[PDB]
């Protein structure tokens, strides 16, 4: 195949390259730490009213969303513009967490293009909103038998809300032509009405806590990037490695090289990556390249015989009629202590001949 001929003349031909083929893929990334403060957002004791909805910016941390899915009370997980499955993969510059409390039938209004009291007067999402909305029932936290009067909403407003706008004003809504002058009455209404939550209400009026995660990308480097998949580490075998984006194939063995604490990768004289530091474990591993060798085939003419011998150049015989030469390991030829003239040169004083194939 290498010589592009069906007849091979007597001699030694470098034909192939012995390689230890890669068996597994080992991909590692740094330990998932510095967890984004989602415990302060979702597991807070006391949220805010929907007119004064509470906004928390989230940056320079690693956000995991598998925390939210492991709690069965978080009933509504509806997300727009990004995949819910790819939330840990696609990553963003800033994450805004907007927390508020509404009733049950107004969770539908927390969506792009919806209308209602909450959508136009309390909390508006844009038509191009990229993010998730999460809601859950909170009877045991926000309902009182005497009535919870600490949750308010805006029922009256002169104009509709812009997206991601708040209005905490308590100015009296003038619905008529007479000036209100700060006193309520007829055609003069206080804009903030109380969500009088009680535990015996119907499900469409029971309190629901809503957290809206809004993801934005800017010109800044995207510093909110969630968990990256990591598999177990396998050593002493030729595997496909990928550490912090750096990919390749090699045998990962223990290293005697003492790295300084700031160094990650290692290079030899020939500027090839031969040492690395695992992201999860602060140990130093040598990347020895998979056991390459030149496969040379020693054969007489095909007119005479079809027997061949294989020379693995620079490979010890325990790492591949087996004879060890300084050229490499010769398999398929039997060493003879007699000395003859050189017929097929092997190297380092070794020659091969056909009489079976002998090496001498």
């Amino acid at each position: 195949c290498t010589l592009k001929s069906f007849t091979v003349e007597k001699g030694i031909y470098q034909t192939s390259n012995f390689r230890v083929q890669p068996t597994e893929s080992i991909v590692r990334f740094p330990n998932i730490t510095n967890l984004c403060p989602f415990d302060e957002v979702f597991n807070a004791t006391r949220f805010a009213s929907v007119y004064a909805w509470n906004r928390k910016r989230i940056s320079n941390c690693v956000a995991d969303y598998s925390v939210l899915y492991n709690l069965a009370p978080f009933f509504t997980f509806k997300c727009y513009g990004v995949s819910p499955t790819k939330l840990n993969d696609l990553c963003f510059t800033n994450v805004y967490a907007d927390s508020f409390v509404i009733r049950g039938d107004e969770v539908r209004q927390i969506a792009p293009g919806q209308t209602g009291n909450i959508a136009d007067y309390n909390y508006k999402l844009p038509d191009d909103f990229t993010g998730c909305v999460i809601a859950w029932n909170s009877n045991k936290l926000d309902s009182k038998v005497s009535g919870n009067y600490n949750y308010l909403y805006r029922l009256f407003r002169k104009s509709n809300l812009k997206p991601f706008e708040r209005d905490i004003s308590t100015e009296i809504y003038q619905a008529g032509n007479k000036p209100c002058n700060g006193v309520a009455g007829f055609n003069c209404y206080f804009p903030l009405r109380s969500y009088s939550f009680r535990p015996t209400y119907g499900v469409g009026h029971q309190p629901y806590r809503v957290v809206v995660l809004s993801f934005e990308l800017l010109h800044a480097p995207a510093t909110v990037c969630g968990p990256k998949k990591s598999t177990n580490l396998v050593k002493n075998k030729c595997v496909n490695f990928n550490f912090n984006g750096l990919k390749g194939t090699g045998v990962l063995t223990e290293s005697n090289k003492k790295f300084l604490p700031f160094q990650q990768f290692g290079r030899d004289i020939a500027d090839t990556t031969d040492a690395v530091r695992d992201p999860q474990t602060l140990e130093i591993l040598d990347i020895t390249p998979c056991s390459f060798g030149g496969v040379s085939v020693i054969t007489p003419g095909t007119n005479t015989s079809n027997q061949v011998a294989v020379l693995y150049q620079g490979v010890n015989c325990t790492e591949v009629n087996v004879f060890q030469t300084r050229a490499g390991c010769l398999i398929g030829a039997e060493y003879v202590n007699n000395s003859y003239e050189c017929d097929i040169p092997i190297g380092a004083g070794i020659c091969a001949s056909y009489q079976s194939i002998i090496a001498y």
Binding site: S59, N60, H219, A220, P221, T223, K257, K258, F259, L260, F262, Q263, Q264, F265, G266, R267, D268, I269, A275
Partner: protein, 248 residues
């Protein structure tokens, strides 16, 4: 809160020789027993480095950042505590603050309304800025810190990444070689063109402890770095200094 200091003594800033200082590790790559050539922002050998003293001398000018800054501190008793980086040093733009007080090392990126003369002052009086309105980044880190200590720092602002390289040496500038290890990789993404260092006063008016600092500027050039068997940089050659080093 700001306090004007009106007890300074007028003196021009000094200049001295850089010798072979200001070298840092160009990257995070281990190398053993090899010579590697790098084209990076480096400080030239035997360059003219600005010398400031703290002794009644209280040197706190505001210097242009340029493409990189080498800061040398011949320090005892830890008078020097931090640095200020920015463009206009007011609330109009966004500024970076590096401080190390008595307890912990704080890095902040806020729109500070800086004092004309900001300083530190047991230490229980902090007069650096009057306000901080829009804070976008906070980072809390480990303590970085006869004259006994040489503290060498290199600050770079490349691609919106602010690199801090540091070295501590037990000791004008000493003549020798010391490679600066990378300490902080900071993701700020802001423009920096001017900086000012922060000092600490001693109150008994006020008295300045004995300290000296040096400011040098980085230029793009090639260095030939020598790496030993342990991966520690021991020697360097400036290719553009003299024909002998160019041959090397």
């Amino acid at each position: 809160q700001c306090v004007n200091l009106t007890t300074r003594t007028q003196l021009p800033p000094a200049y001295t020789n850089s010798f072979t200082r200001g070298v840092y590790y160009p990257d995070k790559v281990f190398r053993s027993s090899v010579l590697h050539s790098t084209q990076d922002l480096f400080l030239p050998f035997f360059s003219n480095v600005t010398w400031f003293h703290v002794i009644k001398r209280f040197d706190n000018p505001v210097l242009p950042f340029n493409d990189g800054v080498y800061f040398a501190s011949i320090e005892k008793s830890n008078i020097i505590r931090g640095w200020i980086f920015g463009t206009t040093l007011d609330s109009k733009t966004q500024s970076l603050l590096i401080v190390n007080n008595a307890t912990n090392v704080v890095i902040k990126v806020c729109e500070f309304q800086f004092c004309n003369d900001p300083f530190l002052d047991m230490e229980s009086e902090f007069r650096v800025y009057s306000s901080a309105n829009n804070c976008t980044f906070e980072y809390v880190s480990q303590p970085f810190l006869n004259f006994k200590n040489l503290r060498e720092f290199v600050f770079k602002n490349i691609d919106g990444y602010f690199k801090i390289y540091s070295k501590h040496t037990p000791i004008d500038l000493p003549q020798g070689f010391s490679a600066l290890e990378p300490l902080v990789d900071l993701p700020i993404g802001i423009n920096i063109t001017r900086f000012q260092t922060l000092l600490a006063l001693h109150r008994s008016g006020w008295t300045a402890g004995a300290a000296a600092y040096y400011v040098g500027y980085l230029q793009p050039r090639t260095f030939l770095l020598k790496y030993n068997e342990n991966g520690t940089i021991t020697d360097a050659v400036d290719c553009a200094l003299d024909p002998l080093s160019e041959t090397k």
